[PDB]
């Protein structure tokens, strides 16, 4: 289900970061006993499929706060500033991917969202 | 498949877990007739 | 198995506190479990407190609990006791005995029951 | 807390004859009774611990056994100097509660 966008499958990754957006669109018996178990190992899954849908909405309130909302891809006006870990398009093209893409930008992504977040409020009313 | 992932035998956080769970497991399961707690300052 | 060099009675007059003595020596004392008996003449003998020597634990009767203290100490290797407000039917002689309990040191235990091993005991005498 | 009796408080039997003396508790006795006997102006000896454990430095006279709630003492030879009192001791509680008997005494039928 929509829980699958989270985390269901066997995805390899690996791929190029750049390249993997490609990827983005694509993504008994009636025993008393045994009944009473199963009602916890039930209830267990039940936990995890509603989290799914409320971790859903949450992400897509704060998108909502960001001004894109339903969207899988984002282009918002907030041109990249080079002074969080200042690189080059070549090496982030070339040697970096998903998973290794959060491990250098986990310290600016609190700032990141914080000016993203700012760079919105003044067009309601002008 | 092809994924790197940086395991830490040493900072483990689930191994605190499970000393702390451990830890009340004894503290009922065990009585001791006589216990001595320094508790220091 | 076990010597004891005990001090005397130093009875102080009705009234005041008391502190019998019970002091052993010759060999190791941290093994020994301790017992302290009351004897009121005539009557019965009457279990008054336990201390284990190498724990420093310390276990009364309900009724004179918190009357009562028997304190120790391996330094010197001697158990104290402390009797507070004194009243003179109290006037009875106390026996601090002993019990082997294996290799404390070593860790081993018994912590038998019994009372096997008696000290001398205490002397009074009642004048006008 | 707990406390035992032994009954009858005195015997009354001339030396010569077989003498069984138990001591009886609400709760189990089959194996944490103690035997004492202090002679007047003395401090008391242990006889039989556990209730069938023998205490060191004593003659093989006297002794302890029977099941349940019936003990006996066995006594082959009677000697009158052991004449003295009779303590019974039941310590089966934890946190600590030992509360002894009150002693049985016998004399000789002395004219
Ligand atoms: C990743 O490894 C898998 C097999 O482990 C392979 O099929 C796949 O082509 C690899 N992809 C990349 C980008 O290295």
């Known amino acids: 289900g929509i829980g699958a966008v989270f985390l269901g499958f066997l995805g390899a990754a690996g791929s190029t970061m750049g390249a993997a957006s490609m990827t983005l669109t694509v993504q008994a018996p009636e025993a008393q006993q045994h009944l009473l178990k199963l009602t916890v190992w039930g209830i267990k899954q039940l936990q995890a499929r509603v989290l799914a849908v409320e971790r859903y909405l949450r992400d897509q309130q704060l998108l909502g706060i960001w001004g894109c909302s339903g969207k899988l891809i984002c282009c918002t006006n907030v041109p990249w500033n080079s002074s969080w870990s200042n690189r080059n398009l070549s090496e982030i093209w070339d040697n970096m991917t998903w998973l290794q893409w959060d491990k250098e930008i986990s310290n600016y992504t609190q700032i990141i969202y914080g000016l993203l977040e700012e760079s919105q409020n003044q067009q309601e009313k002008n | 498949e092809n994924v790197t992932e940086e395991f830490n035998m040493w900072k483990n956080n689930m191994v605190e877990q499970m000393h702390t769970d451990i830890i009340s497991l004894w503290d009922q399961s065990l009585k001791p007739c006589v216990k001595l707690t320094p508790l220091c300052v | 198995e076990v010597q004891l060099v005990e001090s005397g009675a130093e009875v102080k007059k009705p009234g005041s506190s008391v502190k019998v003595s019970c002091k052993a020596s010759?060999?190791?004392?941290?093994?020994?479990?301790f017992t302290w008996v009351r004897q009121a003449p005539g009557q019965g003998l009457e279990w008054m407190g336990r201390?284990?020597?190498?724990?420093?634990?310390?276990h009364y009767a309900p009724h004179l609990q918190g009357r009562v203290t028997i304190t120790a100490d391996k330094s010197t290797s001697t158990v104290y006791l402390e009797l507070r407000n004194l009243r003179s039917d109290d006037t009875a002689v106390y026996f601090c005995?002993?019990?082997?309990?294996?290799?404390?040191?070593?860790?081993?235990?018994?912590?038998?029951?019994?009372?096997?091993?008696w000290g001398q005991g205490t002397l009074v005498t009642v004048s006008s | 807390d707990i406390v035992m009796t032994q009954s009858p408080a005195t015997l009354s039997v001339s030396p010569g004859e077989r003498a069984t003396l138990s001591c009886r508790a609400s709760?189990?006795?089959?194996?944490?009774l103690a035997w004492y006997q202090q002679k007047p102006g003395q401090a008391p000896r242990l006889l039989i611990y556990?209730?069938?454990t023998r205490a060191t430095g004593v003659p093989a006279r006297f002794s302890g056994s029977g099941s349940g709630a019936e003990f006996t003492l066995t006594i082959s030879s009677l000697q009158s100097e052991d004449f003295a009192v009779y303590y019974c001791?039941?310590?089966?509680?934890?946190?600590?509660?030992?509360?002894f008997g009150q002693g049985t005494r016998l004399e000789i039928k002395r004219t």
């Open positions: 010759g060999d190791t004392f941290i093994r020994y479990s």
């Open positions: 201390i284990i020597t190498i724990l420093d634990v310390a």
């Open positions: 001791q039941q310590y089966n509680n934890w946190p600590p509660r030992y509360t």
């Open positions: 709760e189990s006795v089959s194996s944490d």
């Open positions: 005995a002993g019990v082997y309990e294996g290799e404390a040191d070593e860790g081993e235990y018994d912590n038998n029951g019994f009372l096997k091993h």
């Open positions: 556990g209730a069938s």
